[PDB]
Amino acid sequence: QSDSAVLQWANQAAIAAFTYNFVNYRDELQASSGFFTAEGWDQFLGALEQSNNLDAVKAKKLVVSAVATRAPIILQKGVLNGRYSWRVQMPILVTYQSASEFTQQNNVVTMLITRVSTLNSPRGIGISQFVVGPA
């Protein structure tokens, strides 16, 4: 598990979460579940639920897409609760658009990636915590 291996793996992860539309959101959602640890997935869902973004896309029939504003960094790394973790951070530009609309947001995604058995996640690592903020 390289630091760069985790960084990129964390790069796809973030962008994937903001790549879906009102037509396929269920496939896209469920697809990116491998990216997450057992609880990181529960956390990610709970966060989705609380946000409306999804209801917005479904309602206004939008196509979400995102791109990395800057390169992802590792704020801190090392053992957290007997599991080696990386706290990766990266800004993105989300683009909620349709035939009628076109919005953009500047977001900062922060993920806690930890090590996990390859018997459940062939990669070896997983997002234990996915957290979005503005600017």
Residue numbers in the entry: 73 to 207
From the paper:
DotIC crystallized in two distinct forms (Form I and Form II) under different conditions. The structure model of Form I (space group: P21212) was refined to a resolution of 2.2 Å with the working R and the free R factor of 19.1% and 23.5%, respectively, and Form II (space group: I432) to a resolution of 3.5 Å with the working R and the free R factor of 17.9% and 21.6%, respectively. Form I and Form II contain eight and four molecules in its asymmetric unit, respectively, and the structures of these molecules are almost identical. DotIC is a single domain protein composed of four helices (α1 - α4) in one half and one β-sheet in the other half. The octameric rings are also present in the Form II crystal. The four molecules in the asymmetric unit of Form II are arranged as a stack of a quarter of the ring, and the crystallographic four-fold axis produces a stack of two octameric rings. The oligomerization of DotIC is also observed in solution. Although DotIC is in a monomeric state during purification, an oligomeric peak appears in size exclusion chromatography under the crystallization condition. SEC-MALS measurement showed that the apparent molecular weight of the oligomer is 263 kDa, which is consistent with the molecular weight of the stack of two octameric rings. This evidence suggests that octameric ring formation is not a crystal packing artifact, but instead an intrinsic property of the DotIC molecule.
DotI is a 23 kDa inner membrane protein essential for intracellular growth of L. pneumophila within mammalian and protozoan cells. DotI has one transmembrane domain in its N-terminal region, followed by a periplasmic domain13. DotI is conserved in all of the identified type IVB secretion systems, including the conjugation systems of R64 and related plasmids. Structural analysis of the periplasmic domains of DotI and its R64 ortholog TraM demonstrated that DotI and TraM are structural homologs of the T4ASS protein VirB8.
